[PDB]
Ligand binder design. Structure first.
Ligand SMILES: [Ca+2]
Ligand SMILES: [Ca+2]
Ligand SMILES: [Ca+2]
Ligand SMILES: [Ca+2]
Lengths: 718, 718
């Protein structure tokens, strides 16, 4: 008895009298083409539509889409707009749904203001067919859930054509983009594990690792705490140092070059795939501007200046946005400063002494992650509020400005931890003699023994494991399900089952999360190789997970059309242009690559290197400490202390210069900047060259569109 | 008696019998629409055409151009393709000429192969009307020569519409581009002379100039020659040093930032002007691909592999092109090395002693300029030959590849003088103790006293004066005129007068020369401000000069159509992207800006600077010379010599280190690279931001194209 319907509405069964008055007035506008029909239920009833056929011809030449034809060149039919195809039973419920949605948009108060009132609840099309049923008559939703949206069929491809024709163009483009993303993430991940195993095959045969773990030399160290620690041996940090060697060999620079070139070729390959996709569907997705009705506060402000009687308002909301994002980055760095106070002075009062010193930084990044998720929530909501106060012109413009503001907020708050740990961790602290004070209090911030890269490597590694594979996937699969179970604490028609499903929130969260992952996996690959492995695993989970989400825990979308990806290809190009200038900085300002090379070239006095640590570790006469800055226990853990060493490129204390800037500091900084210059310029040239040499329209469409134009112009005479 | 004609041909009046046989066969193809007519003359006769009217309707819907309409919105008529306008006497001779040229192209052997044979000479349309006559009946060529192409009307604008409608789209776009170029060159030139007068207003009040010209201190100098000179005083070079101060103040960095931002906004403004221009003419210049007949050796090679039975050939001609351009840059630097041997050892044997030392470098750049003009000729001819051996597909592809190869050749051979003088002049010579030998002969190359910038400044200044204002303009106005006078050593119908005029050589020389000038005036503005002044003068001459050239000493062009500028906007964007990375290098590696700033910041021990020269001038004990490297006359010109000074950032000889690399050398190199990094990254961001924030379609076309589409769709019903 379930007939052929389209795009139900909501009636609010028992101001409310004004609400039902307009909810009966506007259906007189809505029966200008199609008479409605209503429904019955137990909670609250609703309205419904039954389109008759020629109305879709009445708007089809008014909304010209290139539907199917009768002819075919080479066993692949061509497409034309609307004339004399006349099959009369060949439309699709996606097309019929977006047509009747267009008609619902056509009414004027419009339907958007009606939804903003509360006279309705939601007006969304109905899903055709119950998935995973007992005897269900092969509808495309159930077939798609069977063969696309469960993890057993993760190994085979994605049915792009059917997911488009059932969900519309936007979700089809998004999932085809995720498919191209994973398939281009495959070879970069394979070369990533190749360079990782190169690191493991030279985890021993490199020299400074052995020079660090060679015992009996009793290489002491300055305490790197204000007062609550003592001197110690570098060979106690040799484990983390040998671990750090794994990521910064002279092959990780090749890996970084490969990943930047990979971002370039992925961008070009996705342009080509999207062009072929738009060929395989509607030949253009071009629609005439101002198709949407102008937004409600636009016309309200029009009437306001009509009763009142500008250029300052966009600029003032832009500068207050700049103040917002600057307070956001400062709040990110101060919340990382707070996260450095995870367990301050556990030695003195608690004295539990778990003796790991990898669990404390893990606790720090854990509390940073939970507070930054909360700040993501606050920034998203207040950014949506601010873009509402924007009063933008159209929904395309409002949506673009909103997603730009929200991506800038999310990007800065979820990247300034890693940026701060890379380039502002110990670059600012003074020498062992004197330390810079934070609001005249004490030492600012100092980082772990055995390289300052490994802290960032572990933080980024477990941010990529946790907040992508585990945390975000599990909360996305759980939180709407848990809201459903909360309501579940509190026959079955297709409207009746479609009411309880979750409303749609757009494509912005999936785009935003995947672009955050892209920002990781092309901004911080040089210090941390095998980021494409975790991005591959998250994507393998994510495509089928969000497929299952769409087909099970989501109401039917409205199936809008847009041949462009959106703002997100521009944001991808932006992150790809930022990738080289941050990879250069991470190689030349965190890794031990460039000092290793400059010591191999200049001060070697031999073929290969030896005593590199014995070269960089400048000493410090312990008589020259400041008052109070002495360690509380010169315990003589090993040999003895008379001096302490530290690798800050300074002169020895016995020189007439005491602890000033030595020359080799200027030498290594010169070589560092020389590498940044040559790296950035050369590989930026190589990126723009591999974008020039790649055609953006391949040799299979470039002739074929003209060939079907030949077929059209030869048929069109008579 | 001069009736209404179109596009004459050439008949070769008395193999030759085969020549006249095909020259009678193909006119049977050519009378498929239009019967010909012939002519009589004294030297050698010709053929001619008289189009009848409806043939242009017969190809007009076949070649759809948006001609004029009958209606108008807002006193500006709209345009439509070809239906029911029916004025029957409204075509233009430009349109009729390109139509009959299209018909001449339509014949198959085609007309291009016929011109390649020699059976013809040339087939070009006729100019309508003799310019500057006594009683001439107001034809557009004479009017255009009166009011556009003579230097008295240089002060007013350019008539873009009429020069298009008389010459076609390509020359119209070119001259409108030159107009936009000059009009956007105006404000950059004004700010250039502002920063120049700032330099003149601080030519005295800066400190190191006074510290150089302060006498009685007897600041000696190392000889900077192998053997044939002596020591000397820096105050003898203080004149050129005070001149050098004029160009490298801390305001020339602002000027360089302004010029790079100017290149960005000129690019955007020219995109906007070209878009508005294409609105003001044909709404699209889009034509269906493969409109041209495939090239002759393409089909010949098709038949060759048809009788013979690839991917290697494009790659082998590309690598041989790379070998060609590498030999070109090496030949440029070796010809500058030869040009350094202008007058070697004039002191010893000739002893004329003109005592200028500005005339010798002028002679060097003069001989470099004449030999590089000869090399331009050789490279252009052999590059045309190589692109013929390319066997390209179409004339668009062949022309693009040819102009790319020729521009790369011309650009490298006419820029490696300035690049070599900037960044490879004295950066490679050793210390005064030991010098690097060129093929174990003697000292490589050393540059002038009083800064090494001023040599480049004078060389670039007089290359911009001579080889743009004087030499190229005078040879372009002279050489075809002189060939005409050579033939002049050896009634008057329009064909009869049109035969003796010069054939057309395309737009590539004017584009190429103007892009070379752009490359100067945005690649080397930082060292040499007021390059926009000379570019403004050359352009003010050049627009009216080439206008006069077109309308007087040039046959009528064929008036092809293309809505794009061509490859030249891409080449402009390329030079604009190279501009920042070469301006950064010229500021931080030739100027005295960044060492001035690093001495102002670090080693000052005072507020402002003093003894900057006394800081950089490291000394040299004269006992430590090599054998033979001593000067031939320790003449004691002034005080006395016991040591010689030189500004190469080395330690004094009395240190236990003798003449090694000092620390402050590493310091200033670090600061240099830091400035290159911050400059390049910041202003590249500012360029891409000022390209983002500028819309590429203004608010006067964006609505108006849709408004005339509204008019078209409202008229088109009935
Ligand atoms: Ca997730
Ligand atoms: Ca997700
Ligand atoms: Ca010239
Ligand atoms: Ca010229």
């Amino acid at each position: 008895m379930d007939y052929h319907e389209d795009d139900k509405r909501f009636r609010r069964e028992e101001l409310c009298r004004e609400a039902e008055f307009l909810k009966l007035k506007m259906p007189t506008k809505k029966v200008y083409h199609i008479s409605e029909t209503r429904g019955l239920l137990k909670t609250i009833n609703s309205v419904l539509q039954k389109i008759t056929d020629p109305i879709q011809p009445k708007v089809a030449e008014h909304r010209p889409q290139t539907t199917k034809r009768l002819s075919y060149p080479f066993s692949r039919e061509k497409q034309h707009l609307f004339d004399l195809t006349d099959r009369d039973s060949f439309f699709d419920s996606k097309t019929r749904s977006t047509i009747v949605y267009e008609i619902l948009k056509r009414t004027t108060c419009g339907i958007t203001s009606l939804l903003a009132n509360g006279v309705y609840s939601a007006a969304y099309p109905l899903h055709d067919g119950d998935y995973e049923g007992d005897n269900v008559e092969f509808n495309d939703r159930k077939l798609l859930y069977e063969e696309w949206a469960s993890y057993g069929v993760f190994y085979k491809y994605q049915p792009i054509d059917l997911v488009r024709k059932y969900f519309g163009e936007k979700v089809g483009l998004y999932f085809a983009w995720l498919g191209a993303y994973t398939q281009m993430l495959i070879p970069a991940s394979i070369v990533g594990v190749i360079v990782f195993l190169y690191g493991c095959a030279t985890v021993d045969e490199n020299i400074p690792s052995m020079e660090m773990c060679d015992q009996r030399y009793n290489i002491t160290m300055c305490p790197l705490c204000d007062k609550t620690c003592s001197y110690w041996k570098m060979s106690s940090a040799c484990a983390t140092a040998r671990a750090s060697h794994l990521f910064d060999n002279p092959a990780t620079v090749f890996f970084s070059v490969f990943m930047a070139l990979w971002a370039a070729t992925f961008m070009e390959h996705w342009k080509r795939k999207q062009m072929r996709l738009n060929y395989r569907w509607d030949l253009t997705g071009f629609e005439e501007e101002e198709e949407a009705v102008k937004d409600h506060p636009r016309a309200e402000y029009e009437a306001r200046v009509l009763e009142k009687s500008p250029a300052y308002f966009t600029n003032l909301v832009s500068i207050i946005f700049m103040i917002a994002v600057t307070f956001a980055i400062v709040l990110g760095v101060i919340i990382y400063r707070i996260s450095t106070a995870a367990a301050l002075a556990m030695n003195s009062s608690p004295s539990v002494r778990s003796n790991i010193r990898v669990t404390v930084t893990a606790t720090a990044v854990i509390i940073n992650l939970v507070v930054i998720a909360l700040l993501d929530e606050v920034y998203g909501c207040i950014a949506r509020w601010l873009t509402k106060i924007e009063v933008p012109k159209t929904e395309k413009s409002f949506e673009e400005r909103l997603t730009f503001k929200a991506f800038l907020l999310k990007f800065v708050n979820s990247y300034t931890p890693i940026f701060y740990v890379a380039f502002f961790k110990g670059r600012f602290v003074g020498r062992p003699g004197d330390y810079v004070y934070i609001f005249r209090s004490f030492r600012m911030e100092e980082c772990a023994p055995g390289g300052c890269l490994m802290e960032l490597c572990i933080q980024l590694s477990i941010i990529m494991l946790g907040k992508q594979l585990i945390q975000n996937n599990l909360f996305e699969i759980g939180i709407p399900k848990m809201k459903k179970f909360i309501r579940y604490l509190k026959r079955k028609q297709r409207y009746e089952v479609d009411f309880n499903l979750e409303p749609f929130a757009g494509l912005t969260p999936e785009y935003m999360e995947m672009i955050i992952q892209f920002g990781f996996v092309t901004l911080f690959v040089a210090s941390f190789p095998l980021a494409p492995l975790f991005a591959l695993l998250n994507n393998i989970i994510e495509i089928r997970l969000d497929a299952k989400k769409f087909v099970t825990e989501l109401r039917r979308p409205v199936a809008i059309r847009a041949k462009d990806i959106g703002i997100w290809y521009n944001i991808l190009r932006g992150v790809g242009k930022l990738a080289v200038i941050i990879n250069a900085f991470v190689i030349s300002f965190t890794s031990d690559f460039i000092p290793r090379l400059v010591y191999l070239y200049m001060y070697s006095q031999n073929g290969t290197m030896h005593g590199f640590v014995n070269h960089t570790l400048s000493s410090f006469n312990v008589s020259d400490f400041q008052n109070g800055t002495a360690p509380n226990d010169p315990l003589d853990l090993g040999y003895e202390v008379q001096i302490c060493r530290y690798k800050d490129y300074r002169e020895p204390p016995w020189s007439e210069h005491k602890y000033d800037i030595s020359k080799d500091f200027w030498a290594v900084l010169a070589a560092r900047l020389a590498f940044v210059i040559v790296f950035q310029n050369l590989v930026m040239f190589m990126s723009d060259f591999v974008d020039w040499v790649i055609p953006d329209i391949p040799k299979d469409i470039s002739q074929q569109i003209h060939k079907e134009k030949v077929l059209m112009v030869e048929l069109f005479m008579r």
